[PDB]
Amino acid sequence: ASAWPEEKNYHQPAILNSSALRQIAEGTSISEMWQNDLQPLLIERYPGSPGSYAARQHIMQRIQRLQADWVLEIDTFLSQTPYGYRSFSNIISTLNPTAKRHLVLACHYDSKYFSHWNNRVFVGATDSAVPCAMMLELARALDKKLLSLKPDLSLQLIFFDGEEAFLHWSPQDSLYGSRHLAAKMASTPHPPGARGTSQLHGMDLLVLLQLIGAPNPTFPNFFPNSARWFERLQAIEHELHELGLLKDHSLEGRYFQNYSYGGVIQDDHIPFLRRGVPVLHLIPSPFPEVWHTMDDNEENLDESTIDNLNKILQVFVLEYLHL
Ligand SMILES: [Zn+2]
């Protein structure tokens, strides 16, 4: 009986030096991300809408133009909703599908349904268009390094559909895509041909980004079994800061603060956490002031903060993968 699913417990990062850190900082472009990945997502995209379809096409297109060998899968299913049966489509983007272990980054690409109000449309800029754009920018910025993966560990990105409740949150009205994907991966043998391990045993760590893009975010350390990874984000932020690689940033107002949070926050990670998957939940506490209002738009996004977080995340990913 192989003990490979236990490898994640001991996996250590391969830390980048100063020179490598300046390279990562210089290799990501907040303006390119803004125009090529984010703006096309700032549209009404609740499940089943024409916008949902457009969002999904945009995401698959931006991934397909890259050199790395991404394998795209659309996981489509039906679920009961307050409005009756509906169709949903998760987008899964994987490097090295038969690779036993994967570091997983995720966000939801749907936008909460709201009828038009005084000609205003809800586009959920921080929730979660920016997290989506950040994942695409990461795939783009690290493309050359990720191409080299073509430790049986690789990378996977998941864009969940239907994270939002159609009405207000309830156990049955919310997290449609993730409750579905979690159960699916929990009952899918992995790697192919395996006798007793599933795709969930292969998830080294689930890094879920939500509500990112507002000013002064503060991310607490939610789980003891991922606490050492939270610490790495703290170390990275601190070193990028000391090297002068972040913009309009101070240690007093650092994003990753030494402090926990006992309460449960409902999000796409829940269905995975309840099946034993380690989670690093990158959601700030408190939530952006514009949370679930028509003001969660482009105008209220803090550009340098997103840029800083892009650098932190890309470094975290390269260190995890030893790239
Ligand atoms: Zn939301």
Could you walk me through the main structural features you see in this protein, from its secondary elements to its overall organization?
This protein has 323 residues and is α/β, with parallel strands linked by helices. The chain has one domain (1-323): Zn peptidases (Aminopeptidase, 3-Layer(aba) Sandwich), CATH 3.40.630.10. The chain contains 10 helices and 8 strands. The chain has helices at residues 7-10, 18-26, 30-38, 50-64, 125-141, 143-147, 176-186, 227-242, 270-273, 303-321, and strands at 71-79, 86-94, 101-108, 153-160, 203-209, 219-221, 256-260, 279-282. The strands form 2 sheets. A 6-stranded mixed beta sheet has the order 1-2-4-3-5-8, sandwiched between helices. Helix 3 crosses helix 5 (125-141), helix 5 (125-141) packs across helix 10 (303-321) and helix 8 packs across helix 10 (303-321). The longest helix is centred in the last third of the chain and has 19 residues, at 303-321. It is globular, with a radius of gyration of 19 Å. It starts with 6 loop residues before the first helix and ends with a helix. The structure holds zinc ion. Keywords: Acyltransferase, Disulfide bond, Glycoprotein, Metal-binding, Secreted, Signal, Transferase, Zinc. It comes from Homo sapiens (Human).
